[PDB]
């Protein structure tokens, strides 16, 4: 699985279209800038994306939050230090390394398989299933079907945390609120850590972007 992504919060909206002339010059290159509002059905954010020339940006904005963006990266490329620093001096932000909690690394497990289609309907990609935990170690895997099956037999835009944990606790007795998690991995599409987010395509979907700019609001 290729693309390892690591997010920084930043203390302040940025209009990239307003610097990037600047980034240009400074990397000899022209960088790709791709602008676009989302909607995520329960808000609405702008994501912006930028290309260098497998080194890629990806920025979340809201206005009506208090941590107004953060941005994400991947690729091993040297000139992503370029960009970090080049967006610090070119816009006096603050930016600083996120991790997730565990009940948020479960909410980017459902954000990563749930989504809403133009006639407002719930679908749900699912994968097989595992959570590795480290006490020394061990984890437990749920397979696409019985995930899918557990789900069913629920009502969802949480099965995650609404069907497949509750499932773990009534059908095994372990409770998974209770254990350290340390990832979830869903076969063939992503690894959730605490420190990053592992993908097998070169995107993260927006549904986990939304919820990783909300994990980072302040109270």
């Known amino acids: 699985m290729p693309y390892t992504w690591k997010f920084l919060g930043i203390s302040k909206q940025l209009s990239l279209e307003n610097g990037i002339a600047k980034l240009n010059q400074l990397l000899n290159l022209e960088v790709d800038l791709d602008i676009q509002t989302i909607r995520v059905p329960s808000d609405e954010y702008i ?6 020339d497998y080194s890629k940006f990806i920025f979340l904005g809201n206005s009506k939050m208090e941590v107004p963006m953060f941005l994400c990266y991947c690729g091993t490329d040297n000139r992503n230090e370029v960009v970090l620093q080049w967006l610090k001096a070119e816009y006096g932000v603050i930016m600083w390394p996120i991790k997730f909690e565990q009940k948020t690394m479960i909410k980017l497990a459902d954000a990563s398989i749930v989504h809403v289609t133009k006639e407002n309907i719930e679908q749900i990609t699912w994968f097989s299933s595992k959570l590795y935990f480290e006490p020394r170690q061990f984890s437990i895997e749920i397979p696409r079907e019985s995930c899918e099956g557990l789900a069913l037999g629920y009502g969802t835009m949480h ?32 690894k959730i850590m605490r420190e990053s987010i592992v993908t097998s395509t070169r995107s993260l979907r927006n549904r986990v972007l939304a919820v990783v700019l909300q994990s980072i609001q302040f109270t």
């Open 159 to 190: 099965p995650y945390n609404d069907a497949i944990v509750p499932y773990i606790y009534n059908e095994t007795g372990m409770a998974v609120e209770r254990l350290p998690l340390t990832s979830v991995i869903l076969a063939g599409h992503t």
């Open 47 to 52: 994501r912006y994306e930028m290309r260098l």
